[PDB]
Design an enzyme around this catalytic site. Structure first.
Site, PDB file in Angstrom:
ATOM      1  N   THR A   1     -39.930   8.328  -4.390  1.00  0.00           N
ATOM      2  CA  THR A   1     -39.833   7.617  -3.119  1.00  0.00           C
ATOM      3  C   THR A   1     -38.932   6.392  -3.222  1.00  0.00           C
ATOM      4  OG1 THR A   1     -41.959   8.432  -2.349  1.00  0.00           O
ATOM      5  CG2 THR A   1     -41.155   6.366  -1.378  1.00  0.00           C
TER       6      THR A   1
ATOM      7  N   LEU B   1     -17.513   8.372 -15.368  1.00  0.00           N
ATOM      8  CA  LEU B   1     -16.130   8.029 -15.096  1.00  0.00           C
ATOM      9  C   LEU B   1     -15.265   8.406 -16.288  1.00  0.00           C
ATOM     10  CD1 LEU B   1     -16.764   4.384 -13.698  1.00  0.00           C
ATOM     11  CD2 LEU B   1     -16.556   6.497 -12.376  1.00  0.00           C
TER      12      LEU B   1
HETATM   13  C1  LIG Z   1     -21.089   4.580  -7.961  1.00  0.00           C
HETATM   14  O1  LIG Z   1     -20.728   3.421  -7.256  1.00  0.00           O
HETATM   15  C2  LIG Z   1     -20.832   2.206  -8.011  1.00  0.00           C
HETATM   16  C3  LIG Z   1     -20.444   1.091  -7.069  1.00  0.00           C
HETATM   17  O2  LIG Z   1     -19.069   1.178  -6.721  1.00  0.00           O
HETATM   18  C4  LIG Z   1     -19.946   2.254  -9.253  1.00  0.00           C
HETATM   19  O3  LIG Z   1     -20.357   1.157 -10.063  1.00  0.00           O
HETATM   20  C5  LIG Z   1     -19.392   0.126 -10.313  1.00  0.00           C
HETATM   21  O4  LIG Z   1     -18.647   0.418 -11.465  1.00  0.00           O
HETATM   22  C6  LIG Z   1     -17.706  -0.577 -11.903  1.00  0.00           C
HETATM   23  C7  LIG Z   1     -17.157  -0.069 -13.218  1.00  0.00           C
HETATM   24  O5  LIG Z   1     -18.165   0.579 -13.986  1.00  0.00           O
HETATM   25  C8  LIG Z   1     -18.338  -1.972 -12.031  1.00  0.00           C
HETATM   26  O6  LIG Z   1     -17.249  -2.891 -12.067  1.00  0.00           O
HETATM   27  C9  LIG Z   1     -17.393  -4.170 -12.763  1.00  0.00           C
HETATM   28  O7  LIG Z   1     -18.732  -4.440 -13.256  1.00  0.00           O
HETATM   29  C10 LIG Z   1     -18.917  -5.658 -14.095  1.00  0.00           C
HETATM   30  C11 LIG Z   1     -19.856  -6.665 -13.413  1.00  0.00           C
HETATM   31  O8  LIG Z   1     -20.015  -6.359 -12.029  1.00  0.00           O
HETATM   32  C12 LIG Z   1     -20.990  -7.293 -11.488  1.00  0.00           C
HETATM   33  O9  LIG Z   1     -20.778  -7.515 -10.080  1.00  0.00           O
HETATM   34  C13 LIG Z   1     -21.158  -6.428  -9.177  1.00  0.00           C
HETATM   35  C14 LIG Z   1     -20.765  -6.820  -7.746  1.00  0.00           C
HETATM   36  O10 LIG Z   1     -21.666  -7.819  -7.255  1.00  0.00           O
HETATM   37  C15 LIG Z   1     -22.658  -6.129  -9.339  1.00  0.00           C
HETATM   38  O11 LIG Z   1     -23.077  -5.113  -8.400  1.00  0.00           O
HETATM   39  C16 LIG Z   1     -22.946  -5.702 -10.798  1.00  0.00           C
HETATM   40  O12 LIG Z   1     -24.344  -5.427 -10.947  1.00  0.00           O
HETATM   41  C17 LIG Z   1     -24.610  -4.518 -12.036  1.00  0.00           C
HETATM   42  O13 LIG Z   1     -25.450  -5.116 -12.998  1.00  0.00           O
HETATM   43  C18 LIG Z   1     -26.777  -5.547 -12.528  1.00  0.00           C
HETATM   44  C19 LIG Z   1     -27.593  -5.927 -13.760  1.00  0.00           C
HETATM   45  O14 LIG Z   1     -26.716  -6.507 -14.726  1.00  0.00           O
HETATM   46  C20 LIG Z   1     -27.492  -4.452 -11.650  1.00  0.00           C
HETATM   47  O15 LIG Z   1     -28.548  -5.054 -10.889  1.00  0.00           O
HETATM   48  C21 LIG Z   1     -26.510  -3.710 -10.703  1.00  0.00           C
HETATM   49  O16 LIG Z   1     -27.172  -2.611 -10.067  1.00  0.00           O
HETATM   50  C22 LIG Z   1     -25.289  -3.262 -11.474  1.00  0.00           C
HETATM   51  O17 LIG Z   1     -25.835  -2.458 -12.537  1.00  0.00           O
HETATM   52  C23 LIG Z   1     -25.108  -1.225 -12.729  1.00  0.00           C
HETATM   53  O18 LIG Z   1     -23.719  -1.455 -13.040  1.00  0.00           O
HETATM   54  C24 LIG Z   1     -23.443  -2.045 -14.350  1.00  0.00           C
HETATM   55  C25 LIG Z   1     -21.948  -2.356 -14.444  1.00  0.00           C
HETATM   56  O19 LIG Z   1     -21.745  -3.680 -13.937  1.00  0.00           O
HETATM   57  C26 LIG Z   1     -23.962  -1.092 -15.439  1.00  0.00           C
HETATM   58  O20 LIG Z   1     -23.645  -1.609 -16.740  1.00  0.00           O
HETATM   59  C27 LIG Z   1     -25.500  -0.911 -15.263  1.00  0.00           C
HETATM   60  O21 LIG Z   1     -26.017  -0.038 -16.260  1.00  0.00           O
HETATM   61  C28 LIG Z   1     -25.865  -0.412 -13.846  1.00  0.00           C
HETATM   62  O22 LIG Z   1     -25.526   0.974 -13.826  1.00  0.00           O
HETATM   63  C29 LIG Z   1     -22.462  -6.770 -11.805  1.00  0.00           C
HETATM   64  O23 LIG Z   1     -23.427  -7.836 -11.746  1.00  0.00           O
HETATM   65  C30 LIG Z   1     -17.565  -6.272 -14.492  1.00  0.00           C
HETATM   66  O24 LIG Z   1     -17.783  -7.275 -15.479  1.00  0.00           O
HETATM   67  C31 LIG Z   1     -16.654  -5.158 -15.035  1.00  0.00           C
HETATM   68  O25 LIG Z   1     -15.476  -5.710 -15.673  1.00  0.00           O
HETATM   69  C32 LIG Z   1     -15.340  -5.250 -17.045  1.00  0.00           C
HETATM   70  O26 LIG Z   1     -14.476  -4.151 -17.120  1.00  0.00           O
HETATM   71  C33 LIG Z   1     -13.208  -4.393 -16.500  1.00  0.00           C
HETATM   72  C34 LIG Z   1     -12.483  -3.064 -16.400  1.00  0.00           C
HETATM   73  O27 LIG Z   1     -11.244  -3.304 -15.745  1.00  0.00           O
HETATM   74  C35 LIG Z   1     -12.409  -5.439 -17.309  1.00  0.00           C
HETATM   75  O28 LIG Z   1     -11.324  -5.914 -16.503  1.00  0.00           O
HETATM   76  C36 LIG Z   1     -13.262  -6.664 -17.797  1.00  0.00           C
HETATM   77  O29 LIG Z   1     -12.712  -7.148 -19.028  1.00  0.00           O
HETATM   78  C37 LIG Z   1     -14.808  -6.434 -17.927  1.00  0.00           C
HETATM   79  O30 LIG Z   1     -15.076  -6.261 -19.344  1.00  0.00           O
HETATM   80  C38 LIG Z   1     -16.061  -7.238 -19.774  1.00  0.00           C
HETATM   81  O31 LIG Z   1     -17.186  -6.578 -20.331  1.00  0.00           O
HETATM   82  C39 LIG Z   1     -16.915  -5.841 -21.543  1.00  0.00           C
HETATM   83  C40 LIG Z   1     -18.170  -5.063 -21.895  1.00  0.00           C
HETATM   84  O32 LIG Z   1     -19.283  -5.747 -21.330  1.00  0.00           O
HETATM   85  C41 LIG Z   1     -16.487  -6.837 -22.644  1.00  0.00           C
HETATM   86  O33 LIG Z   1     -16.207  -6.127 -23.855  1.00  0.00           O
HETATM   87  C42 LIG Z   1     -15.240  -7.652 -22.201  1.00  0.00           C
HETATM   88  O34 LIG Z   1     -14.951  -8.667 -23.167  1.00  0.00           O
HETATM   89  C43 LIG Z   1     -15.399  -8.259 -20.796  1.00  0.00           C
HETATM   90  O35 LIG Z   1     -16.177  -9.461 -20.983  1.00  0.00           O
HETATM   91  C44 LIG Z   1     -16.307  -4.162 -13.913  1.00  0.00           C
HETATM   92  O36 LIG Z   1     -15.028  -4.561 -13.409  1.00  0.00           O
HETATM   93  C45 LIG Z   1     -19.230  -2.301 -10.839  1.00  0.00           C
HETATM   94  O37 LIG Z   1     -19.993  -3.474 -11.098  1.00  0.00           O
HETATM   95  C46 LIG Z   1     -20.180  -1.150 -10.528  1.00  0.00           C
HETATM   96  N1  LIG Z   1     -20.993  -1.462  -9.363  1.00  0.00           N
HETATM   97  C47 LIG Z   1     -22.272  -1.087  -9.219  1.00  0.00           C
HETATM   98  C48 LIG Z   1     -22.936  -1.504  -7.940  1.00  0.00           C
HETATM   99  O38 LIG Z   1     -22.866  -0.446 -10.083  1.00  0.00           O
HETATM  100  C49 LIG Z   1     -20.157   3.546 -10.041  1.00  0.00           C
HETATM  101  O39 LIG Z   1     -19.143   3.680 -11.029  1.00  0.00           O
HETATM  102  C50 LIG Z   1     -20.138   4.781  -9.132  1.00  0.00           C
HETATM  103  N2  LIG Z   1     -20.496   5.967  -9.891  1.00  0.00           N
HETATM  104  C51 LIG Z   1     -19.729   7.062  -9.961  1.00  0.00           C
HETATM  105  C52 LIG Z   1     -20.262   8.187 -10.803  1.00  0.00           C
HETATM  106  O40 LIG Z   1     -18.656   7.144  -9.369  1.00  0.00           O
HETATM  107  C1  LIG Z   2     -34.074   4.451   5.473  1.00  0.00           C
HETATM  108  C2  LIG Z   2     -34.069   2.960   5.132  1.00  0.00           C
HETATM  109  C3  LIG Z   2     -33.206   2.228   6.170  1.00  0.00           C
HETATM  110  C4  LIG Z   2     -33.436   2.782   3.752  1.00  0.00           C
HETATM  111  C5  LIG Z   2     -35.501   2.411   5.134  1.00  0.00           C
HETATM  112  C6  LIG Z   2     -36.020   1.768   6.253  1.00  0.00           C
HETATM  113  C7  LIG Z   2     -37.313   1.273   6.254  1.00  0.00           C
HETATM  114  C8  LIG Z   2     -38.137   1.400   5.136  1.00  0.00           C
HETATM  115  C9  LIG Z   2     -39.504   0.867   5.162  1.00  0.00           C
HETATM  116  C10 LIG Z   2     -40.531   1.042   4.316  1.00  0.00           C
HETATM  117  S1  LIG Z   2     -40.591   1.978   2.866  1.00  0.00           S
HETATM  118  C11 LIG Z   2     -42.263   1.504   2.632  1.00  0.00           C
HETATM  119  N1  LIG Z   2     -42.950   1.951   1.567  1.00  0.00           N
HETATM  120  C12 LIG Z   2     -42.388   2.842   0.541  1.00  0.00           C
HETATM  121  C13 LIG Z   2     -43.525   3.015  -0.461  1.00  0.00           C
HETATM  122  C14 LIG Z   2     -44.775   2.650   0.276  1.00  0.00           C
HETATM  123  C15 LIG Z   2     -44.348   1.607   1.290  1.00  0.00           C
HETATM  124  N2  LIG Z   2     -42.779   0.706   3.546  1.00  0.00           N
HETATM  125  C16 LIG Z   2     -41.868   0.399   4.527  1.00  0.00           C
HETATM  126  O1  LIG Z   2     -42.105  -0.329   5.491  1.00  0.00           O
HETATM  127  C17 LIG Z   2     -37.608   2.047   4.018  1.00  0.00           C
HETATM  128  C18 LIG Z   2     -36.317   2.542   4.017  1.00  0.00           C
HETATM  129 CA   LIG Z   3     -16.785   7.199 -19.188  1.00  0.00          CA
HETATM  130 ZN   LIG Z   4     -45.200  10.917  -2.669  1.00  0.00          ZN
END
Ligand SMILES: *[C@@H]1O[C@H](CO)[C@@H](O[C@@H]2O[C@H](CO)[C@@H](O[C@H]3O[C@H](CO[C@H]4O[C@H](CO)[C@@H](O)[C@H](O[C@H]5O[C@H](CO)[C@@H](O)[C@H](O)[C@@H]5O[C@H]5O[C@H](CO)[C@@H](O)[C@H](O)[C@@H]5O)[C@@H]4O)[C@@H](O)[C@H](O[C@H]4O[C@H](CO)[C@@H](O)[C@H](O)[C@@H]4O[C@H]4O[C@H](CO)[C@@H](O)[C@H](O)[C@@H]4O)[C@@H]3O)[C@H](O)[C@H]2NC(C)=O)[C@H](O)[C@H]1NC(C)=O
Ligand SMILES: CC(C)(C)c1ccc(/C=C2\SC(N3CCCC3)=NC2=O)cc1
Ligand SMILES: [Ca+2]
Ligand SMILES: [Zn+2]
Ligand SMILES: CC(C)(C)c1ccc(/C=C2\SC(N3CCCC3)=NC2=O)cc1
Ligand SMILES: [Cl-]
EC number: 3.1.4.39
Length: 804
Positions: A159, A689
């Site tokens: 969910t 990717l």
């Molecule tokens: C599905 O769609 C999503 C969304 O478009 C896409 O995901 C994107 O992929 C990009 C590439 O993988 C990535 O780009 C940059 O990411 C980081 C930091 O980004 C931050 O800012 C964004 C925007 O606000 C945040 O959303 C992001 O949050 C992530 O982390 C949080 C916890 O830490 C988490 O809550 C959140 O959900 C998200 O987690 C997910 O993504 C991360 C990647 O960030 C994963 O690791 C997690 O496991 C999880 O899956 C961040 O807070 C930048 O720093 C990157 O820059 C790198 O690489 C560059 C490449 O050009 C380079 O220029 C830089 O040097 C840099 O390298 C640095 O790091 C190296 C290793 O750490 C280090 O060696 C070096 O020295 C240097 O310091 C990326 O430019 C997007 O963030 C990402 N977005 C999201 C929402 O996930 C997916 O790819 C697709 N999927 C498919 C299958 O298509």
């Molecule tokens: C489709 C969209 C726009 C993403 C959406 C919109 C509204 C809700 C609201 C929820 S979900 C929820 N839960 C889930 C576990 C038990 C309680 N209680 C809520 O009031 C959730 C999703």
């Molecule tokens: Ca890869």
């Molecule tokens: Zn259920």
């Protein structure tokens, strides 16, 4: 703590959350135990029910009523949803004939059609057809608006992951909600279904629709509702908000129902107890639509009826126990149920070994109802590996079954008859989508699509720019009358070289041999035409794939196939060829079994060599264009070029050989010819990717030949199979796969039998969208067709699921 000394008078269901210790009056204050003392008294009124009776019309207004039937209720915006039907002779919305909504018909001061999302938990897709007799309101929305026969959830079909995917357009691995229960090792914190850690924002990645609206000037009603607030009160609150002044009225709203999921767990997806929950949902929909009709909004508001996942028959007796497979059952932590996730119980134990855990769980009982994977070996269509909250070891549980650690955990920790969470291509897990309103189409059935695509559409419906997400924007344009986002093809980044004959045979030192010295100006000129691309229109049917990243590659033309050969990776990025229905399969002649030929178009320095494969006792090689499908004995020498060679484990060559020798011909027979594009994939960090060169973790021993993690093929033909693949006038038909390149066939428990018993089953499990392959390769397919780009985007998101 909260000092709840303030009052809710005039604040009921306020749209801004106030700061503590001042008490709250919003629709979530119960879940934080922060409602003002008088919230129940003033906001959650219940007196006299939820409907107007004939003897309530014109009544003196009494503020203690839950809803009102007085003459001023339309002005106050708080009539019971049936007020006009009972008191002013109106008809229910379900009883009106449905008329096409060509243009929005909105009251003065509505800048845009509002969007209302009616979300239902556990609403299995087949309910739409099987319960249609008891859901008249929902059936009117489905039949008169835009609907799909089913919508595919994300994996896990749980969910929280699916609701937050709907909100963000992201795979769970990207938005961070990878299950209903999670442990984040970096945080050292656990996320629970029941609990208060789940409220910390650090768990929630991405940008959900309500944040996207707010950041772009579109006001959102509060989407979420404390469980104790009855559904009728939720609908009245939404209708009340819709009567707010223009400057204060939200443009997007959400309703949520815990049914039919709540009963489905207890009674099974089709238990006789399930009819009444379906009736109740429909009545709630009827109350909403009646209320919209009262406000003159029923031809103004876009309504989305959408589920998160389905429901399957699952009972206690169908449980597999890890204690029946493992000796060290106390050394592992298990996240149980319709999926399995395993990790070490204690970090300070280096005598924990995942390899031995996987082996003990692999094909150990003949009826085994789960299969273990290292998460990077899970089918790529699940997109479930790239998060630290996803344990390395995953159990894919068969539908209708559970996995548990010990029998103790089941009887003291049967009640339930239904559950969900299984593989997202399982039929019982499919859920519903219906769109109804001016911006949706009229009486239109759309093909099944994935819920990751909805976020873009909901942004389209609101004039919002979507945050980056995993939908393919424009692939759902055929759901919409207007507001379509018009996508453009990405520009090619690298253009290819077209090498001619530039090298002599003796310039190569590849250690390769071939018995090919057996050798007519008519036919000598004929094969030169082939090397220049004279037959390229036959084998490259949709244009060359575009390379969307900076690299150096060559286009190589042959009589039977065409390839883009990467000088960086020393192998084709893609190999394209057409096999017609009349094409005949031949064998590899006895003298050409080990034949590998240098390509005089490509330098020795940018070529593989046979010596590496001889030395690498683990690695053999295969060919992207199959020699078995050569059009002539003379053409077959082309298939042995070193530029057609790719590294393959002997165990995988069993899979690949059966696909090339048997399955391609079978597909060509069945689909009236097929066009096949095959190639390698490198995803060593399992992020979905394309890997860059410096991320490759394995090479053919003693060489710079990179080892693919996967091999793909894209098999395209004519949707109208009365036309051949190479002479198709209309829409196309596609199926694809991303086969993991593994040194064993442990995934296939029957692999010791003939390939005809297990290979195609493996390929079905690893079916893929073309879009999945594009992410993994940096390639853009279908550049040159006669079809509209949006239709091509829809084709690229298609997944061939092989369900019945
Ligand atoms: C599905 O769609 C999503 C969304 O478009 C896409 O995901 C994107 O992929 C990009 C590439 O993988 C990535 O780009 C940059 O990411 C980081 C930091 O980004 C931050 O800012 C964004 C925007 O606000 C945040 O959303 C992001 O949050 C992530 O982390 C949080 C916890 O830490 C988490 O809550 C959140 O959900 C998200 O987690 C997910 O993504 C991360 C990647 O960030 C994963 O690791 C997690 O496991 C999880 O899956 C961040 O807070 C930048 O720093 C990157 O820059 C790198 O690489 C560059 C490449 O050009 C380079 O220029 C830089 O040097 C840099 O390298 C640095 O790091 C190296 C290793 O750490 C280090 O060696 C070096 O020295 C240097 O310091 C990326 O430019 C997007 O963030 C990402 N977005 C999201 C929402 O996930 C997916 O790819 C697709 N999927 C498919 C299958 O298509
Ligand atoms: C489709 C969209 C726009 C993403 C959406 C919109 C509204 C809700 C609201 C929820 S979900 C929820 N839960 C889930 C576990 C038990 C309680 N209680 C809520 O009031 C959730 C999703
Ligand atoms: Ca890869
Ligand atoms: Zn259920
Ligand atoms: C499953 C369901 C009902 C859809 C749901 C349930 C709880 C939350 C909570 C959120 S989201 C959040 N964010 C989003 C990015 C910025 C901070 N902070 C939170 O506390 C969200 C959604
Ligand atoms: Cl879970």
């Amino acid at each position: 703590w909260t000092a709840t000394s303030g009052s809710c008078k005039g604040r009921c269901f306020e749209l801004q959350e106030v700061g503590p210790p001042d008490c709250r009056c919003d629709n979530l204050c119960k879940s934080y135990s922060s409602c003002c003392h008088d919230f129940d008294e003033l906001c959650l009124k219940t007196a006299r029910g939820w409907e107007c009776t004939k003897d309530r019309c014109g009544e003196v207004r009494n503020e203690e009523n839950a809803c009102h039937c007085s003459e001023d209720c339309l002005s106050r915006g708080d009539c019971c949803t049936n007020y006009q039907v009972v008191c002013k002779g109106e008809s229910h919305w379900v009883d009106d004939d449905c008329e096409e909504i060509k243009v929005p018909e909105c009251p003065a001061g509505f800048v845009r059609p509002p969007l209302i999302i009616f979300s239902v938990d556990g609403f299995r897709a087949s309910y739409m057809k099987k319960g249609s007799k008891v859901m008249p309101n929902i059936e009117k929305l489905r039949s008169c608006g835009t609907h799909a026969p089913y919508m595919r959830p994300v994996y896990p079909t749980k969910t929280f992951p699916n609701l937050y995917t709907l909100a963000t357009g992201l795979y769970p691995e990207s938005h961070g909600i990878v299950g209903n229960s999670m442990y984040d090792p970096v945080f050292d914190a656990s996320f629970h279904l029941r609990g208060r850690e789940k409220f910390n924002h650090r768990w929630w990645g991405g940008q959900p629709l309500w944040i996207t609206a707010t950041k772009q000037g579109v006001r959102a009603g509060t989407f979420f509702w404390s469980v104790s607030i009855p559904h009728e009160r939720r609908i009245l609150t939404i209708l009340q908000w819709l009567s707010l002044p223009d400057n204060e009225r939200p443009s997007v709203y959400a309703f949520y129902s815990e049914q039919p999921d709540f009963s489905g767990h207890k009674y099974g997806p089709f238990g006789p107890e399930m009819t009444n929950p379906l009736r109740e949902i429909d009545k709630t929909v009827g109350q909403l639509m009646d209320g919209l009709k009262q406000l003159r909004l029923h031809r103004c508001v876009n309504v989305i009826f959408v589920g998160d996942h389905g429901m399957e028959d699952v009972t206690c007796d169908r449980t597999e126990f890890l204690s029946n497979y493992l000796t060290n059952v106390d050394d592992i932590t298990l996240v149980p149920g319709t999926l399995g996730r395993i990790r070490a119980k204690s970090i300070n134990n280096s005598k924990y070994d995942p390899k031995t855990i996987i082996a003990a769980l692999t094909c150990k009982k003949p009826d085994q109802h789960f299969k273990p994977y290292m998460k990077q070996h899970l089918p790529k269509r699940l997109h479930y590996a790239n998060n630290r909250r996803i344990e390395d070891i995953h159990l894919l549980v068969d539908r209708r079954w559970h996995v548990a650690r010990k029998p103790l955990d089941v009887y003291k920790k049967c009640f339930f008859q239904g559950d969900h969470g299984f593989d997202n291509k399982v039929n019982s897990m499919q859920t519903v989508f219906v769109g109804y309103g001016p911006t949706f189409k009229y009486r239109t059935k759309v093909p099944p699509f994935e819920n990751i695509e909805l976020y873009n559409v909901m942004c389209d419906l609101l004039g919002l720019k979507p945050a980056p997400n995993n939908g393919t924007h424009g692939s759902l344009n055929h759901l919409l009358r207007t507001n379509t986002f018009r996508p453009t093809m990405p520009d090619e980044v690298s253009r290819p070289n077209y090498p001619g004959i530039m090298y002599l045979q003796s310039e190569f030192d590849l250690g390769c041999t071939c018995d090919d010295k057996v050798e007519n100006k008519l036919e000598e000129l004929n094969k030169r035409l082939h090397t220049k691309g004279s037959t390229k229109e036959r084998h490259l049917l949709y244009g060359r794939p575009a390379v969307l990243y900076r690299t150096s590659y060559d286009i190589l033309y042959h009589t039977d196939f065409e390839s883009g050969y990467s000088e960086i990776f020393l192998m084709p990025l893609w190999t394209s060829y057409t096999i017609s229905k009349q094409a005949e399969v031949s064998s590899i002649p006895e003298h050409l079994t080990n034949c590998v030929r240098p390509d005089v178009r490509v330098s020795p320095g940018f070529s593989q060599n046979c010596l590496a494969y001889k030395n690498d006792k683990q690695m053999s090689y295969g060919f992207l264009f199959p020699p078995y499908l050569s059009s002539s004995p003379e053409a077959k020498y082309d298939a042995f070029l070193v530029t057609n060679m790719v590294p393959m484990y002997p165990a995988f060559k069993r899979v690949w050989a059966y696909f090339q020798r048997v399955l391609v011909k079978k597909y060509a027979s069945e689909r009236n010819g097929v066009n096949v594009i095959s190639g390698p994939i490198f995803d060593y960090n399992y992020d979905g990717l394309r890997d860059t060169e410096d991320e490759i973790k394995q090479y053919v021993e003693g060489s710079s030949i990179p080892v693919p993690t996967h091999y793909y093929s894209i098999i395209t033909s004519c949707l109208d199979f009365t036309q051949p693949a190479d002479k198709c006038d209309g829409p196309l038909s596609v199926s694809s796969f991303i086969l993991p390149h593994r040194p064993d066939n442990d995934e296939s428990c029957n692999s010791s039998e003939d390939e005809s018993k297990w290979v195609e089953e493996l390929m079905k499990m690893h079916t893929a969208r073309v879009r999945d392959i594009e992410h993994l390769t940096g390639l853009d397919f279908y550049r040159k067709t006669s079809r509209s780009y949006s239709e091509i985007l829809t084709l690229k998101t298609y997944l061939h699921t092989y369900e019945s």
